[PDB]
């Protein structure tokens, strides 16, 4: 019943906890659907109350509100923009310093979904000061929080060259290069994901990846037994090889040609074609 959504939004002002939790679950439920469902939640006026609940001292209420905002931020760019225009970003950035790992994880989920939108939505994340907090979380001992910070930084690095350069200017490259030494393979995969998105920009952004010293580690990861890590390193290297001759020359000087020509005989047909295309990009001019 469409009449239930305004009543659900009305229950967001309820002094009772279980009424509040029930309405937040329904909103989080509806926002689990398509954009049409998320649009009905927004049109019911749920965003202003949801943003206010980000200041709740109750741990369970803050988690349910973050999960509802997270799911709404998984919609279209204009629905992500409604989340931005409702004022959610300053609270999410503040929540990036919370000692509660459950709260911090959910705040990272919402920020990552917002950063999954267009360049206008990614720039709002940048302008709210999310980057230096995200870069700081790359030093977290929690492997789960570390993955969430990599997911958020990768989505920000999925925008235009201006958004990619903001990630570089925030000092994310030295932490990403060091994460290539991680024995944890799912963290190592997310770091390659972020580096590949950064290396997909212009020659300035590609040279910044080279200047951070990422090439020796990327070349070594071409010998990884994990074919997912092997491919991600191959994708990151081929993005770097797409740059100018100075960029291709650094890839060759890192010894990538020997491994790339070997990977043409790899047992995976997909890897063979990517190694072949990387060698094509390495032809100068």
């Amino acid at each position: 019943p469409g009449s239930e959504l305004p009543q659900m939004v009305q229950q967001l002002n309820s002094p009772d906890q279980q009424e509040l939790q029930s309405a937040l679950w329904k909103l989080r439920n509806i926002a689990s659907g398509g954009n049409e469902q998320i649009q009905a939640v927004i049109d019911a006026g749920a965003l202003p109350a949801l943003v206010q609940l980000l200041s709740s001292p109750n741990e369970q209420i803050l988690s349910s509100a973050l999960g509802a905002l997270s799911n709404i931020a998984s919609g279209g760019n204009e629905q992500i923009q409604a989340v931005i225009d409702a004022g959610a970003l300053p609270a999410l950035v503040q929540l990036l310093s919370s000692p509660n790992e459950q709260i911090l994880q959910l705040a990272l989920w919402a920020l990552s979904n917002i950063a999954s939108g267009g360049n206008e939505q990614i720039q709002a994340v940048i302008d709210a000061g999310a980057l230096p907090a995200l870069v700081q979380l790359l030093s977290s001992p929690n492997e789960q929080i570390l993955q969430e910070a990599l997911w958020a930084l990768s989505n920000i690095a999925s925008g235009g060259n201006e958004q990619i350069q903001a990630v570089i200017d925030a000092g994310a490259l030295p932490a990403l290069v060091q994460l290539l030494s991680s024995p944890n393979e799912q963290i190592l995969q997310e770091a390659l994901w972020a580096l590949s998105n950064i290396a997909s920009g212009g020659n300035e952004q590609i040279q910044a990846v080279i200047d951070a010293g990422a090439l020796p580690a990327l070349v070594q990861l071409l010998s990884s037994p994990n074919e997912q890590i092997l491919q991600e390193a191959l994708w990151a290297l081929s993005n770097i090889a797409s740059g100018g001759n100075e960029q291709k020359q650094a890839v060759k000087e890192a010894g990538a040609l020997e491994k790339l020509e070997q990977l043409q005989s790899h047992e995976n047909e997909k890897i063979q074609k990517e190694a072949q295309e990387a060698l094509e990009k390495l032809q100068s001019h």
């Binding site: 689990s32 799911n71 989920w109 999954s116 997911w151 690095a157 997909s200 990151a236």
Partner: peptide, 12 residues
């Protein structure tokens, strides 16, 4: 490689 975005929905 292209630039890859990732959205996630919660089930709880």
């Amino acid at each position: 490689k292209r630039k890859r975005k990732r959205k996630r929905k919660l089930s709880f």
